[PDB]
UniProtKB/Swiss-Prot annotation, chain A:
Name the UniProt record assigns to this protein: Pre-mRNA-processing-splicing factor 8
Function: Plays a role in pre-mRNA splicing as core component of precatalytic, catalytic and postcatalytic spliceosomal complexes, both of the predominant U2-type spliceosome and the minor U12-type spliceosome. Functions as a scaffold that mediates the ordered assembly of spliceosomal proteins and snRNAs. Required for the assembly of the U4/U6-U5 tri-snRNP complex, a building block of the spliceosome. Functions as a scaffold that positions spliceosomal U2, U5 and U6 snRNAs at splice sites on pre-mRNA substrates, so that splicing can occur. Interacts with both the 5' and the 3' splice site.
Cellular compartments annotated: Nucleus; Nucleus speckle
Associated disorder: Retinitis pigmentosa 13: A retinal dystrophy belonging to the group of pigmentary retinopathies. Retinitis pigmentosa is characterized by retinal pigment deposits visible on fundus examination and primary loss of rod photoreceptor cells followed by secondary loss of cone photoreceptors. Patients typically have night vision blindness and loss of midperipheral visual field. As their condition progresses, they lose their far peripheral visual field and eventually central vision as well.
Tissue specificity comment: Widely expressed.
Organism: Homo sapiens
SUBUNIT field: Part of the U5 snRNP complex. Component of the U4/U6-U5 tri-snRNP complex composed of the U4, U6 and U5 snRNAs and at least PRPF3, PRPF4, PRPF6, PRPF8, PRPF31, SNRNP200, TXNL4A, SNRNP40, DDX23, CD2BP2, PPIH, SNU13, EFTUD2, SART1 and USP39. Component of the U5.U4atac/U6atac snRNP complexes in U12-dependent spliceosomes. Within the minor spliceosome, which acts on U12-type introns, interacts with PPIL2 and RBM48. Core component of U2-type precatalytic, catalytic and postcatalytic spliceosomal complexes. Found in a mRNA splicing-dependent exon junction complex (EJC) with SRRM1.
Domain notes: The MPN (JAB/Mov34) domain mediates interaction with TSSC4 and SNRNP200. Has structural similarity with deubiquitinating enzymes, but lacks the residues that would bind the catalytic metal ion.
Taxonomy, superkingdom: Eukaryota
Curated annotation (Swiss-Prot), chain B:
Subcellular compartments: Nucleus; Chromosome
Post-translational modification: In vitro phosphorylated by CLK1 and U1 snRNP-associated protein kinase. Phosphorylated by SRPK2 and this phosphorylation is required for its association with the tri-snRNP (U4/U6-U5 tri-small nuclear ribonucleoproteins) and subsequent spliceosomal B complex formation. May be phosphorylated by SRPK2 on Ser residues in the SR domain; the phosphorylation is required for the removal of inappropriate R-loops during transcription.
Purpose: Involved in pre-mRNA splicing and its phosphorylated form (by SRPK2) is required for spliceosomal B complex formation. Independently of its spliceosome formation function, required for the suppression of incorrect R-loops formed during transcription; R-loops are composed of a DNA:RNA hybrid and the associated non-template single-stranded DNA.
Family statement: Belongs to the DEAD box helicase family. DDX23/PRP28 subfamily.
Subunit structure, as described in the record: The phosphorylated form (by SRPK2) is a component of the U4/U6-U5 tri-snRNP complex composed of the U4, U6 and U5 snRNAs and at least PRPF3, PRPF4, PRPF6, PRPF8, PRPF31, SNRNP200, TXNL4A, WDR57, SNRNP40, DDX23, CD2BP2, PPIH, SNU13, EFTUD2, SART1 and USP39. Identified in the spliceosome C complex. Interacts with ERBB4. Interacts with ERCC6.
UniProt-recorded name of the protein: Probable ATP-dependent RNA helicase DDX23
Superkingdom, taxonomy of origin: Eukaryota
Length: 49, 25
């Protein structure tokens, strides 16, 4: 789909971040509020049957 | 020094993509 630039802070320090396994997009989609900055219009999916 | 001289004398005689993904993230 077509779409509906951040400085270095104290918060996004990569020296504080442990890079062990690469985080993908389906992690952001399955859990929309844990890994997302500005999660505006997401919808909560079904968990499990 | 003779040993160093003889030594000097007879020497003349996916992964990148996943790092790219982390960098783009």
């Amino acid at each position: 789909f077509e779409p509906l630039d951040e400085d270095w802070n104290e918060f996004n320090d990569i020296n504080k971040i442990i890079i062990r396994q690469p985080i993908r997009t389906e992690y952001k989609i399955a859990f929309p509020y844990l890994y997302n900055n500005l999660p505006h219009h997401v919808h909560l999916t079904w968990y499990h049957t | 020094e003779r040993k160093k001289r003889k030594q000097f004398q007879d020497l003349g005689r996916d992964k990148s993509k996943e790092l790219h993904a982390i960098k783009e993230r």
